[PDB]
C-alpha cells in the first residue's frame, strides 16, 4: 500500500513537471 502511494506521488510530480514544461504560459514580448 505504501509503495503504491510513493509511486503515485512520484508519477504525479513528473506529470506536474510535464505540464509546467509543455503547457506553460507562453512568453510574450511587450510592444
Amino acid at each position: 500500500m505504501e509503495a503504491l502511494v510513493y509511486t503515485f506521488l512520484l508519477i504525479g510530480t513528473l506529470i506536474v513537471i510535464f505540464f509546467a514544461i509543455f503547457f506553460r504560459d507562453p512568453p510574450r514580448i511587450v510592444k
Partner: protein, 328 residues
C-alpha cells in the same frame, strides 16, 4: 533541385523553432538521458536486492522490496564485478544481471554520457542564438562533481561498488564511508567547496535582496510588484545607485561592485570554482591522497598525548571505519 533528406534533417535538428532545442549534442543527450531515466524509475520501483558486498548478503533498494523514497536507491554494482564492463547481454540471465547491480552500471553510464552531451548542447544553443558560450563552462562544475562521485572514485578504488548509490540514504552512506576512509572534512579542497557553496548562497541572497530592495515603483498598492517589470523592456527595473549606496554604507564607504559586469562574473565564478575544487578533491582522494592529518599533534613534556578536536574527529572516523570494514 529538390532538397536532400539530410538537408531537411540538419535543418530540423539545429532548428531554433523547436520547443526543446535538440542539436547534434542532443542527438546523444536525449536517447541516453531517456534510457537512464526509464531504467532508474523501473529499478527504483521494482528491482530485486543487489549483492553489493560480493558475499551473498544482498541490499534491498526498490520500493516493492520494503523501503520508502528516502531509503530507496539503485544499489551500486557488485564487488565481484569491480570496474568490469557489465552490460545486460554479458550476464547469463536477467536475474543474475539484477543480482549483480547491472542497473547501476546502465543508469550511470547513460547519465554520464547525457550530462556531457548536455554541456555540449548548452554550448550549441548559445551558438545558434548568437550569445557568449560560457554557460557550459559553469555547468562543467556539477558535471565534474558527478563524474568524480560516480566514475572516477570507482576507478581509483577499483570497483563500481564504491560509487555513490542512486538514492538519498545511499548518498548519506557514501558520505559517511568516504569521511571514514579519507577524512574529506579536513581536506582543503572540500573546505574550498563548502566555501563556494556557502558563499554562493550568501551572494545569491545578497544580490537578490539588493535588487528586490531597490525596485522602482510601477504598480499600485498591494498589487504584485513583479507586474512592474515588462518582459522585453529596455529600461532598468531597479534603482542601481540606491542599492549601491546601501551596500556601500553597509560595510565600508566604497565597496559596492559598481560595474554590474564584474559583479555578475563574480557571482558566476565563485561557486563554479568552489565546486571544481571539491570535485578535484573527491577525485584526488580516490587515489589515497587524503586530507590533513593533525593526529597526536600536541604532546606534553613527558610524551603523553594531549587530544585536540582533530582527535575527536578521528575517533568518529575510526568508529565509522570499524563499522564499515566488515571482517577486513
Amino acid at each position: 533541385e529538390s532538397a536532400s533528406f539530410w538537408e531537411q534533417f540538419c535543418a530540423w535538428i539545429t532548428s531554433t523553432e523547436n520547443r526543446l532545442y535538440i542539436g547534434w549534442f542532443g542527438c546523444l543527450m536525449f536517447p541516453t538521458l531517456l534510457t537512464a531515466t526509464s531504467a532508474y524509475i523501473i529499478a527504483f520501483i521494482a528491482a530485486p536486492p543487489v549483492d553489493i558486498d560480493g558475499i551473498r548478503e544482498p541490499v534491498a533498494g526498490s520500493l516493492l522490496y520494503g523501503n520508502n523514497i528516502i531509503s530507496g536507491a539503485v544499489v551500486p554494482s557488485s564487488n565481484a564485478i569491480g570496474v568490469h564492463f557489465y552490460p545486460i547481454w554479458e550476464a547469463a540471465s536477467i536475474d543474475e544481471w539484477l543480482y549483480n547491480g547491472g542497473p547501476y552500471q546502465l543508469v550511470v553510464f547513460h547519465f554520464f554520457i547525457g550530462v556531457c552531451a548536455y554541456i555540449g548542447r548548452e554550448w550549441e544553443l548559445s551558438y545558434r542564438l548568437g550569445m557568449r558560450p560560457w554557460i557550459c563552462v559553469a555547468f562543467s562544475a556539477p558535471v565534474a562533481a558527478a563524474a568524480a562521485v560516480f566514475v572516477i572514485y570507482p576507478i581509483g578504488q577499483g570497483s563500481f561498488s564504491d560509487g555513490m548509490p542512486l538514492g538519498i540514504s545511499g548518498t548519506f552512506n557514501f558520505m559517511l564511508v568516504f569521511q571514514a576512509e579519507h577524512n574529506i572534512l579536513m581536506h582543503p579542497f572540500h573546505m574550498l567547496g563548502v566555501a563556494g557553496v556557502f558563499g554562493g548562497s550568501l551572494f545569491s541572497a545578497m544580490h537578490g535582496s539588493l535588487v528586490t530592495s531597490s525596485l522602482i515603483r510601477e504598480t499600485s498598492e498591494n498589487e504584485s510588484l513583479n507586474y512592474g517589470y515588462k518582459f522585453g523592456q529596455e529600461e532598468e527595473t531597479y534603482n542601481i545607485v540606491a542599492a549601491h549606496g546601501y551596500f556601500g554604507r553597509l560595510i565600508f564607504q566604497y565597496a559596492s561592485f559598481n560595474n554590474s559586469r564584474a559583479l555578475h562574473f563574480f557571482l558566476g565564478a565563485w561557486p563554479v570554482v568552489g565546486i571544481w575544487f571539491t570535485a578535484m578533491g573527491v577525485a584526488t582522494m580516490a587515489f589515497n591522497l587524503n586530507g590533513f592529518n593533525f593526529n597526536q599533534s600536541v604532546v606534553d613534556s613527558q610524551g603523553r598525548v594531549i587530544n585536540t578536536w582533530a582527535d575527536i574527529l578521528n575517533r568518529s572516523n575510526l568508529g565509522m571505519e570499524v563499522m564499515h570494514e566488515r571482517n577486513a
